[PDB]
Design a binder for these strands. Structure first.
Length: 121
RNA sequence: UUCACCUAGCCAACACGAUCCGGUUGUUUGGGAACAAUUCCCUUCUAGAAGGGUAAUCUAUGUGCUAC
């Protein structure tokens, strides 16, 4: 687990680093956010996403991790290239350069609560 | 492909694998139950006749009875 202090430069290692994404969406969505979740999953597979994501009617956040260069494209896609209406984009934290990764597969957390408890809640 | 999340609610006979045990550890030829009164008649033989017995209990599935 050698840090970037060993010899990363602009020759060949400039595109050999990992990190975490930074995004926090907020605003109303069509139906219950089904369109946004489906669109994000298809694009995420092409970029070989590892982290997870959360989608809902209003709340939309998550933690996405991957390559330093791969995540750069997603920043522009999820800021202007949005078919739905977006109010504003927030940020929580970011970090570039880290040995190995935490997650292994891309998945979206969905509300699988039973319908019986929905009325009580 | 809810690869997710707790398990006093799993197989060692699909397979890998911690420890004990080591059956020339394989092969040739066979078997692996529920149903006995023998070809019964001095009337008959190269064109049809007389006798066949374990009645012990459950679960899951096809199939039947309806008008005086």
């Amino acid at each position: 687990t050698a840090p970037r202090v060993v010899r990363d430069r602009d020759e060949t290692n400039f595109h050999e680093m990992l990190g975490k994404f930074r995004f926090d969406l907020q605003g109303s969505f069509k139906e219950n956010g089904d369109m946004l979740r489906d669109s994000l999953l298809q694009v995420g597979r092409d970029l070989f996403l590892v982290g997870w994501v959360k989608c809902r009617s209003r709340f939309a956040t998550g933690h996405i991790q991957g390559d330093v260069h791969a995540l750069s494209y997603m920043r522009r896609y999820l800021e202007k290239h949005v078919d739905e209406s977006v109010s504003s984009v927030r940020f929580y934290e970011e970090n570039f350069g880290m040995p190995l990764l935490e997650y292994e597969r891309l998945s979206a957390v969905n509300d699988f609560r039973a319908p019986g408890k929905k009325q009580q809640h």
